[PDB]
């Protein structure tokens, strides 16, 4: 699970 | 999509308001530059810029209407291009130098610190000079940067937004008193520079994900994953 | 320069007249594809196309007005780009396929014969599909190809402006409104960024050590490759 | 002396 994917939800 | 219904002025205003802040590097004037220290400075700066780029991207009209996977794909594809075009923008009023940060202003000889870097510094300086001669306006800049985000990784909603930005760009040129011919010509000139930015990014990326450059300084996990997104398709040693 | 005095129609006529021929490859239908045989076909084809491209460039208005150095530089930079846009253009009415030659029509599965090649085949296919959705015209194509040559590396900038004028002339002639002209001009030029990208990634494989060892390359092709590899990271 | 250079003449 990518971090860019995570940050795009914050 | 509420993006498709924006006017040209509303589009410009949205892009200007979405502009990320100018960050400072952690430049330490007490020690001489080495290949490692120079790469560390630029890596640290680029990493902190990425977080602000992500938030900026969410505020580009039409972008948030895409699936998370498309958002990821576009940013993975465009990140170095976006960083580069930002660099050449803020370097415009500094001929022969590259303003990475207000406390990090470098010339091409300082680019010789890192193996294979001065060649890209030379292309970035030339691009900055080219913008300066065209008298590139800030409104035109934010249009170009958004085009890079939306265009670079696409190959119907996106194409509609891209047309909207094209309209906005023309609107700006008309408002600036350019004739109909001068408009098409300037639009063409700007968009052709984007091909050079793509070229610079690919050349730089090739060095960045080289085995040497991936082991000179510690990279954050985010930056590491942005690199790999391109590195995975590169020739396998 | 006589190129700066040409009309739009004259520009189109000259570009259309300068178009290189479509060449054949020596593909054997009974022989299955290996990494070496596949590379051998494409290399042989590209090498023969290069000679035609060089003479095609001399017939691009304004090009022969440049110095020998700038001519060499532009061609060294653009050669894979020009080969690629040629490929995607002739593959336009073959969805999901790449018409390298009339006797060589390949799909993405055949591109997996070569390590790292299916990814570029995908990009080329998407580009060809993009041109098909745009209903790209032949007159527009020869303009885009000439733009690629001149933009790859003040006189050049004047010729580029002329070709831009030529493109707009073509679109207005097709009955497009002003807004539709600007938008289409943009759509076409942004595709050039993708063509640049495909060339960069493609060239990276091509001048790799696995790629230069698999098949014999001609001296011309070998020198076209090294002109790019010079800027590549030294291990 | 490059080949491309020769072919351009
Ligand atoms: O393309 S580069 O020139 O990258 C290199 C790096 C090493 C060797 C050759 C090229 C790049 C442009 C500029 O300088 C480099 C670099 C950089 C980017 C990411 C990194 O992880 C490290 C450095 C630059 C940069 C940094 C921040 C910006 O906002 C704009 C550009
Ligand atoms: O970008 S490539 O996909 O190149 C490669 C090659 C090996 C591994 C990965 C990519 C390129 C596109 C097309 O297929 C390759 C390739 C090619 C060109 C020169 C060579 O010496 C070898 C091959 C192609 C090509 C060949 C002829 C054309 O008219 C158009 C495209």
Question: What's the arrangement of secondary structure elements?
Answer:
The complex is a heterotetramer, with two copies of chain A and two copies of chain B.
Chain A: H1 3-7
Chain B: H1 8-17, H2 35-58, H3 68-90, E1 98-101, E2 104-106, H4 118-133, H5 138-151, H6 157-175, H7 180-208, H8 221-231
Antiparallel strand pairs in B: 1-2
Helix pairs in contact in B: 1-6, 2-3, 3-4, 3-5, 3-7, 3-8, 4-7, 5-6, 6-7
The complex binds ligand OBH (2 copies).
Report the principal-axis shape of chain B.
globular
The amount of helix of chain A comes to 40-55%
CATH architecture assignment of chain B: Orthogonal Bundle
Bound compounds: the ligand O=S(=O)(OC1C=CCC=C1)[C@@H]1C[C@@H]2O[C@H]1C(c1ccc(O)cc1)=C2c1ccc(O)cc1
Largest sheet of chain B: 2 strands, antiparallel
Largest interface: B-C, 42 and 43 residues
Strand order of the largest sheet of chain B: 1-2
| Share in helix of chain B | 55-70%
**Helix tally of chain A?**
1
Straight-line distance between termini of chain A? 15 Å
CATH class of chain B: Mainly Alpha
The largest pleated sheet of chain A is described as: none
Q: Give the N-terminus to C-terminus distance of chain B in angstroms.
A: 45 Å
- Run of helices and strands of chain A: H
Secondary-structure element pattern of chain B, one letter each: HHHEEHHHHH
The radius of gyration over CA of chain A amounts to: 5 Å
- The dominant shape of chain A is elongated
Protein name (chain B): Estrogen receptor
Subcellular location (chain B): Nucleus; Golgi apparatus; Cell membrane
Family (chain B): Belongs to the nuclear hormone receptor family. NR3 subfamily.
Organism (chain B): Homo sapiens (Human)
């Amino acid at each position: 699970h990518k971090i860019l994917h995570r940050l795009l939800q914050d | 999509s509420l993006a498709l219904s924006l006017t040209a002025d509303q589009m410009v205003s949205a892009l200007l308001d979405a502009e990320p802040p100018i960050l400072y590097s952690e430049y330490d004037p007490t020690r001489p530059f080495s290949e490692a220290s120079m790469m560390g400075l630029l890596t640290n700066l680029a990493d902190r810029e990425l977080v602000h780029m992500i938030n900026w991207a969410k505020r580009v009209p039409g972008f948030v209407d895409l699936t998370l996977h498309d958002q990821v794909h576009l940013l993975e594809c465009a990140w170095l291009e976006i960083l580069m075009i930002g660099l050449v923008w803020r370097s415009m009023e500094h001929p022969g130098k590259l303003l990475f940060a207000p406390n990090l202003l470098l010339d091409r000889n300082q680019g010789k610190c890192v193996e294979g870097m001065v060649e890209i510094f030379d292309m970035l300086l030339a691009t900055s000079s080219r913008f300066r001669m065209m008298n590139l306006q800030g409104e035109e800049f934010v249009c170009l940067k958004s085009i890079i985000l939306l265009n670079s990784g696409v190959y119907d909603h996106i194409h509609r937004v891209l047309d909207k930005i094209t309209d906005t760009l023309i609107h700006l040129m008309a408002k600036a008193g350019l004739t109909l011919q001068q408009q098409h010509q300037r639009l063409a000139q700007l968009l052709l520079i984007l091909s050079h930015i793509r070229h610079m990014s690919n050349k730089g990326m090739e060095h960045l994900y080289s085995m040497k450059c991936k082991n000179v300084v510690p990279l954050s996990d985010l930056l590491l994953e942005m690199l790999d997104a391109h590195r995975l398709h590169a020739p396998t040693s």
